[PDB]
Amino acid sequence: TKPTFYVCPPPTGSTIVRLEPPRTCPDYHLGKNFTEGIAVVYKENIAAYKFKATVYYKDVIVSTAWAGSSYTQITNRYADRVPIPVSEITDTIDKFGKCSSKATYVRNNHKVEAFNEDKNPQDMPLIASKYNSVGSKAWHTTNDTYMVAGTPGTYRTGTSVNCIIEEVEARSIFPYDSFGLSTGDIIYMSPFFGLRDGAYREHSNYAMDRFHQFEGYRQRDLDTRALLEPAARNFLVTPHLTVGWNWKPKRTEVCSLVKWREVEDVVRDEYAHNFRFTMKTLSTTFISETNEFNLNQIHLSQCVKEEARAIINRIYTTRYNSSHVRTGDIQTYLARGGFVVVFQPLLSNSNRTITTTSSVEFAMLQFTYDHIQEHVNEMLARISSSWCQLQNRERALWSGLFPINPSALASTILDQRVKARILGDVISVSNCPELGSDTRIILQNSMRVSGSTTRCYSRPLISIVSLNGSGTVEGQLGTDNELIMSRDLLEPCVANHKRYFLFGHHYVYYEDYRYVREIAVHDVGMISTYVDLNLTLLKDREFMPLQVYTRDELRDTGLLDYSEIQRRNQMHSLRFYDIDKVVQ
Amino acid sequence: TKPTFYVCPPPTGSTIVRLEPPRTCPDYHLGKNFTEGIAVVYKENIAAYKFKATVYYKDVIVSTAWAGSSYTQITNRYADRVPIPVSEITDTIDKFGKCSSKATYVRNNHKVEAFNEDKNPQDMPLIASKYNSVGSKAWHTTNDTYMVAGTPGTYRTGTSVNCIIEEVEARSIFPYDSFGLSTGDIIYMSPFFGLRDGAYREHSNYAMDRFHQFEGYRQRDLDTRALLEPAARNFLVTPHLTVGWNWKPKRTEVCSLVKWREVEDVVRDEYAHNFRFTMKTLSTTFISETNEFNLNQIHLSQCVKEEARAIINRIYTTRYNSSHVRTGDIQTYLARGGFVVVFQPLLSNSNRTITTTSSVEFAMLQFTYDHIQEHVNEMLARISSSWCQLQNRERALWSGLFPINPSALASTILDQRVKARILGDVISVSNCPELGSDTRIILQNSMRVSGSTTRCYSRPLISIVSLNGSGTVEGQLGTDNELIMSRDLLEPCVANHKRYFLFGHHYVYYEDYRYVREIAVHDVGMISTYVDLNLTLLKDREFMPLQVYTRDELRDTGLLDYSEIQRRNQMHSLRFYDIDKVVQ
Amino acid sequence: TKPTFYVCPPPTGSTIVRLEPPRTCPDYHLGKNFTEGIAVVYKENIAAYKFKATVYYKDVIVSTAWAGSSYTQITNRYADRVPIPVSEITDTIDKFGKCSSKATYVRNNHKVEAFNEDKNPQDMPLIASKYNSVGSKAWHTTNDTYMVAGTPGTYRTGTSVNCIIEEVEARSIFPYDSFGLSTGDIIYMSPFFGLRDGAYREHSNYAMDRFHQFEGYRQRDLDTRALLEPAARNFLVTPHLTVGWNWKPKRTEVCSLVKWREVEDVVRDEYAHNFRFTMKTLSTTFISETNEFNLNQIHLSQCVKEEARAIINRIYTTRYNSSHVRTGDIQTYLARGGFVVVFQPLLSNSNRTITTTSSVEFAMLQFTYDHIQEHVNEMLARISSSWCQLQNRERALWSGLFPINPSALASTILDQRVKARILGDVISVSNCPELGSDTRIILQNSMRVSGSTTRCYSRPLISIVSLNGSGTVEGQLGTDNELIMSRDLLEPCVANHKRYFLFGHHYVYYEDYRYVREIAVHDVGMISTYVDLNLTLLKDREFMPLQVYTRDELRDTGLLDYSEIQRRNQMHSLRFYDIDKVVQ
Ligand SMILES: *[C@@H]1O[C@H](CO)[C@@H](O[C@@H]2O[C@H](CO)[C@@H](O[C@H]3O[C@H](CO[C@H]4O[C@H](CO)[C@@H](O)[C@H](O[C@H]5O[C@H](CO)[C@@H](O)[C@H](O)[C@@H]5O)[C@@H]4O)[C@@H](O)[C@H](O[C@H]4O[C@H](CO)[C@@H](O)[C@H](O)[C@@H]4O)[C@@H]3O)[C@H](O)[C@H]2NC(C)=O)[C@H](O)[C@H]1NC(C)=O
Ligand SMILES: *[C@@H]1O[C@H](CO)[C@@H](O[C@@H]2O[C@H](CO)[C@@H](O[C@H]3O[C@H](CO[C@H]4O[C@H](CO)[C@@H](O)[C@H](O[C@H]5O[C@H](CO)[C@@H](O)[C@H](O)[C@@H]5O)[C@@H]4O)[C@@H](O)[C@H](O[C@H]4O[C@H](CO)[C@@H](O)[C@H](O)[C@@H]4O)[C@@H]3O)[C@H](O)[C@H]2NC(C)=O)[C@H](O)[C@H]1NC(C)=O
Ligand SMILES: *[C@@H]1O[C@H](CO)[C@@H](O[C@@H]2O[C@H](CO)[C@@H](O[C@H]3O[C@H](CO[C@H]4O[C@H](CO)[C@@H](O)[C@H](O[C@H]5O[C@H](CO)[C@@H](O)[C@H](O)[C@@H]5O)[C@@H]4O)[C@@H](O)[C@H](O[C@H]4O[C@H](CO)[C@@H](O)[C@H](O)[C@@H]4O)[C@@H]3O)[C@H](O)[C@H]2NC(C)=O)[C@H](O)[C@H]1NC(C)=O
Ligand SMILES: *[C@@H]1O[C@H](CO)[C@@H](O)[C@H](O)[C@H]1NC(C)=O
Ligand SMILES: *[C@@H]1O[C@H](CO)[C@@H](O)[C@H](O)[C@H]1NC(C)=O
Ligand SMILES: *[C@@H]1O[C@H](CO)[C@@H](O)[C@H](O)[C@H]1NC(C)=O
């Protein structure tokens, strides 16, 4: 509650200062050279190469029964899948639509045969299965299996043979040196093995005697009974069945890269030694290197070039036909995480394999961060430039207002109470030491000069009585609790005089140069020159490691688990038998 | 180092200007109409429907031995799994807990039988396996397998039959038209096939003679020897075993959608034709359309409605019991990426299938971007409003300070040195052309008027001597290196005169109207009116395509790989035999 | 188009106000105590434990042929895999590199034997398969299979036996109580079962008579014919083959945690009860708890401690050898989502199992949000501090300029036209009520005082004629369309008088105290004191649920699908046979 006053001795030319000329503000050259265009992004092809084939085999069952007193007993049953030799196929099924009843094959290196029901061989028609729905079709000749019992006390052996033609779906994966079938049989030969076009250099685990090729082969549709259209056709006689598939060259069917996404409007900027591809429709930003990608380092990449050319030409002709024009041939870049962006640059009218990560967020995060960063940097640059203009403008008010009141402005700028004079075009400042304790300042009642009536004081008079015995100073009350050491502020005595003066924590009121009243500072109504800026801060957040499906849930979508079946079924003999007891 | 001076000819009323009235600032109406409430998010169910069943079968082994000189030789061994007909089950096992020793079945379309050890049929008790741990239990009758040798030189055939009852776990996937068992057998009949409640319209690949239903069937627990509780029970006699499972209706057990996450506090805002669901506890924002979702377009969605009703009612009663109140029935929205949000709106007291993506991460990105965007937009709006108030306030200082010094303020505003006059309520400006070269300005030593002593000049006097022969102008030094063409700035000769004047790069010092000294501008102490704003920019970042597990690592978690086993084991005959040699 | 004037009655001391002292601005203490260091992040090990083993078995085929008239007929063929007893192995193959031609085994609890071709037993050399490429090698003795036909009308039975030694790859998963082989056989014994070191306490589903251990066993390489180096070796005789594998202790080979990523420069800050690990090279932020993690709660975690010690010591010695120094032993924290960060703190020179999520995004998002939040909060703090200094500085201009023009500044601050007086050190304001309608203000032509020539008016004179009959006021035009009710603003008649005054929407021009002309306000040239701030807002974005591979694509990378093979092949008997017809 104690007011602090100062005592400012008269200044001296010692400390002179000046206002700095207006500072220049940096011009922020934020903005890069970009390039609009069209892009097609390609990922690695992880799917298996899928085609359709046919299996031709005969089901040769050999049943041995023991005819008993009142029953028949099967004492053996040997089921076996045997191939159909290509001679019978190309000479009987695709000729008359019939299949011989006699199996001729090779087992244990011997040429063995077998006859259904031990009868004369016939040619039976191939009849569709009862479940021949779409896709999975099969034609067989016999619905019955033959066995005989005999007279009680003897063994009799029967035998069935069932000509079966099934359409299967084959499937081969890189490096395409084998393919498995829906029946479960692995065929250790590439689907592109042949005799011409350098195909004889494919992989094959079989001898060339098992392999037959029919150029111009006209396969037969067993439903419409009509020959199909000519097409080279491979036939391979596996020890347990015969596979046949339409031959197709390797160069035109499989390709390591597949189109992932077409992007109509991209923008390529160049940031510090690296390219950047911003795609605002996907909200995805890929970051490549400045070098081109040579598609000769990747196996089987012949599709992408022409595929992307057709797609990119269509996109340009359908969207940018009139606004822009092309500027050269397509460029190929390897984006980060294993992607391949085929980029066509537009202008306005003015060996290994690639492994792709399984994400797109490392890119969506990149786009979002780039957006916020670019925008916030632009806004900060604008704030900075605007701030400079405002300071350079306020320098004029400060420089133009010093003549009117130099001491107040110099005390504000230096954040310390000082007394300043204008010595022409410069300012001579001087520190005002604060009035210490042991000092009693008494306030006089009247502002009138003694005896004189046309002249009166301007500010209230005070008496700074000293306590250390240094006498008694008699001055008057300056401004902002500044105590001048003289009474040289007089004025012509105005009429209807009313003034308020700041005395510590009070506003003393003087009417006709005499004390009238006093009012606390906290009682006077307030006027604010302050403009408000209530800026709130971003709060801290914590992200939870959320998931839509767990690994268990993702390994729970199939009908059977191979490892489960094997763990449960491979202890059939341990569970239900005693493998440790010996019989003597 | 050369100072540049100007020469300002007297202005003319030609160019008059004025201060613009205060500009209005836009009121930013940033803020949307939101709606708090509770939500439950549902994903597609990708798991298989799992139940428990029992398999009843007999292991019929037929061994053929050749008794030799000093050894016995197995010349054949035919193992086979055969069904247990439902008559024996429902009449002997669930009646006395015993199983007949005689197998009666159908092979090759003939009714065949077989007897263990070729003896009289018995009824053996079903005994638990030695490995009957939790879950996987099995009861069998015989631990031994019977075979006989005979006299050296003859073949003898034995036969075992082992009654086996196993509890398996069945598993069926959409569209639920088959189910596989832990033993490996596919049962081509839906788990919900029956005779009542329209169940006879399910899928079945078998004839109705193989199917038996026992309404009110009381199954028997082979451990506590006690009947279980009544429940309709289906029995199906597959050619190789008999499956039995408790029947359950399709409408009450399987449902395409499963609850993923309950969210207690959500907020639905409406942004440009689309809904948005902000969930601050998950930090996830889903973006749907304005339309409701009809759950009748999705197969098997009967669970979600009532399930969500119970959960949502519990959540309200446990958290928002007193603060808010409900405002109508639940609404169903299809969020983006394939999710289903069942949203219950609160208020304060004042056919196909759905395919779900495997990542809500695009939604965590959405939430984070929405947060930064909303907050930064709010802060920019506040900066803009505050900026307007500050400019509208500084307009008062500029307008109020022009009378004191019009030329300085007009030179600052126009960013060009000009001379302005106040022609009443307007300002008449005039350009000040800069003083060119070939001009020598000489500085006079004394500021005193010749002869006069009570009158002296205010600013130093200069002599602008010309070189093109245009004579010699004699004026004095104005302010800011302005060269007035006259000497009309006089003053009453003050006592103790001290002034500093700016002469190019120097402050010339004059004491009693005579030159005294000079000081370089770079030597005078400085006072700064500048407030600092050191704003730093966001730097560029590069995100690496990081992963926790690769695709290989994710295909390395199982005990066996089916394709690996098949590639290695299906060349057993090629590796270890010579399939190309013929014997003659 | 109508100008609005005011009428301000003379103020009264009633409403006095004052400028607020400068407001203090909060010092933003944004900044946390961080700790630099090195970290190694460890994920859960999901891969199977993979080792190499050898299988020793004999292929015993038993063929029964029926020699016919002009052909041979196989009436049975029983293939079987039989073990090689360990006596023959350790006494003949690893001694001489030969294998006996006689199989001795146990089937149906009887000790059975069999001889290839029914000949005298021999010792045949083990010969490599023709396909012995890298890795998968196999040595067998016979490429041929023996069978005989006989005289037409009789059955003859042959038999092959083929000694086969294959190198397989075994594979066991947690809790390591079984392992499967590449041949498909499950071995129900832990790979770490033994006789010493407490290994006899592992899991084993077999009797101890089937198990043999050879301490110091020197296995034999069948290619270089040389003994290998000594190593304890387990042998187990499974009912269908014999497995042999080098024994290795459980404590030194398998460990639940695997090193995921080494991070050279991390920074651990402490935010609200939780630790945070910022890794700027990965752009990843993990958020743990303040507690240490006890690695004794996790099974098989013995690797991580010493592994991380070696790696962390190497990292320090290679990068931070001279800049920093260590500050204690390593600390172990469980980050969120199931990760384990082993953190070594640096200083400058001044039981269950852990389940890991499959993401590295919930943390890349965390890092990015932390970066934007920290930077934007720092910038907002700087804007706020700068704003305070600027307001505290502008308070000096407002306080210092009130003496010059109190009414204009008080009208601007209060955003309302008022009339203010300076009553010493305070300001007494008074509201100026606006001049209503029914009032005609007439403008006089001359500014000259009647008769007097050395004295003239300063502002144009007006006559406010009243219409309600209240007479006619005669005053003059004040400033800013303020209508003073008196004519007390006179001036010494200057020469060359030129003034512009604002009359509504016009600037009336007066030359020598007489009306001259008028100009519309919209016609006067403009000067702007306004500094521009064009701040643009962030626009709304929508993220699409993008994916690189779908779930189908990820389940399409294998050669065969087990469930597909089983669904297609398990209806072989239903498709191609008639299981519903009975023969009588
Ligand atoms: C061994 O026995 C089986 C039967 O156990 C024999 O199968 C028969 O042969 C038919 C020809 O292959 C086969 O397909 C037939 O039916 C197909 C389905 O069409 C429906 O409408 C039929 C009435 O016209 C109806 O009988 C039939 O119902 C049977 O099939 C359904 C299918 O799920 C079962 O649910 C039933 O239980 C029942 O078994 C169907 O509802 C039909 O598409 C077939 O037509 C073929 O040919 C057409 C040319 O005209 C062509 O246009 C069409 O696309 C098809 O390719 C065909 O009519 C049946 O399964 C069965 N036939 C009968 C009398 O039901 C099998 O042939 C035999 N094998 C040998 C070698 O002997
Ligand atoms: C063919 O031969 C096999 C043996 O080769 C027969 O199996 C026997 O029959 C028992 C009943 O099915 C079967 O289970 C028994 O043991 C179970 C384990 O309990 C433990 O504690 C026992 C102490 O009393 C101990 O002997 C036993 O150790 C045996 O089993 C473990 C299993 O890992 C082996 O590791 C050992 O080598 C040893 O063989 C166990 O440690 C036990 O749970 C069973 O109790 C059942 O019934 C209880 C009712 O009272 C019930 O409460 C409980 O829940 C169980 O359901 C039971 O005691 C054994 O494998 C074996 N018995 C013996 C004497 O070892 C098989 O029956 C036979 N098949 C036929 C048809 O002939
Ligand atoms: C049952 O019959 C099969 C044949 O049907 C017998 O297999 C023979 O035995 C050889 C030894 O195991 C086996 O491997 C031999 O060839 C390997 C490949 O090397 C190549 O270069 C050879 C030039 O000399 C060339 O002949 C050979 O071409 C054959 O094999 C390739 C393999 O794909 C086929 O594509 C061809 O069609 C052709 O069949 C190869 O191109 C070779 O690595 C082997 O050397 C081993 O031993 C070396 C020690 O000196 C060692 O350095 C090396 O690392 C190998 O371990 C070996 O020469 C062949 O498959 C075959 N031999 C012949 C004559 O082709 C099998 O032995 C028999 N089983 C029994 C028990 O009777
Ligand atoms: C700023 O705004 C927030 C939001 O309502 C408010 O809580 C806070 O009190 C405000 N601060 C000031 C100083 O007005
Ligand atoms: C702004 O702050 C940064 C951070 O320390 C500093 O490097 C830079 O020099 C500062 N700029 C100015 C102009 O002070
Ligand atoms: C602000 O800048 C944007 C960007 O070009 C522009 O469209 C807009 O008109 C500007 N606003 C103002 C008021 O100048």
Author numbering:
A (entry chain B), B (entry chain A), C (entry chain C): 115 to 464, 503 to 736
Question: What did the article's authors report about this structure?
Answer:
A cooperative assembly of glycoproteins composed of the trimeric gB and the heterodimer gH-gL constitutes the core herpesvirus fusion complex. As for other herpesviruses, VZV employs gB and gH-gL for virion entry fusion. Unlike the closely related herpes simplex virus (HSV) gB orthologues, the mature glycosylated form of VZV gB (~130kDa) is cleaved into two fragments (~69kDa and ~73kDa) at the 491RSRR494 furin recognition site.
Structures of native, full-length VZV gB (cryo-EM; 3.9Å) and the VZV gB ectodomain (X-ray crystallography; 2.4Å) were determined in the absence of bound antibodies to define the structure of the N-terminal region (amino acids (aa)72-114), which was found to be a part of DIV but flexible and not fully resolved by cryo-EM or X-ray crystallography. Cryo-EM 2D class averages generated from 349,207 particles revealed four globular regions of gB, three in the ectodomain and one in the CTD. In contrast to the ectodomain, the cryo-EM map resolution of the CTD, including the MPR, transmembrane (TM) and gBcyt, was >7.0Å due to extensive flexibility in the CTD that was apparent from the 2D class averages. The Cα backbone could not be traced for aa72-114 in either the cryo-EM or X-ray crystallography datasets. Importantly, the detection of peptides corresponding to aa94-114 verified the presence of the N-terminus in full-length gB and supports flexibility as the reason for failure to resolve this region in the gB structures. The gB cryo-EM structures did not differ in the presence or absence of 93k and SG2 Fabs, indicating that the gB ectodomain in its post fusion form was not altered by antibody binding. Comparison of the cryo-EM map derived model of native gB purified from VZV infected cells with the gB crystal structure demonstrated that the W180G and Y185G substitutions did not affect fusion loop topology.
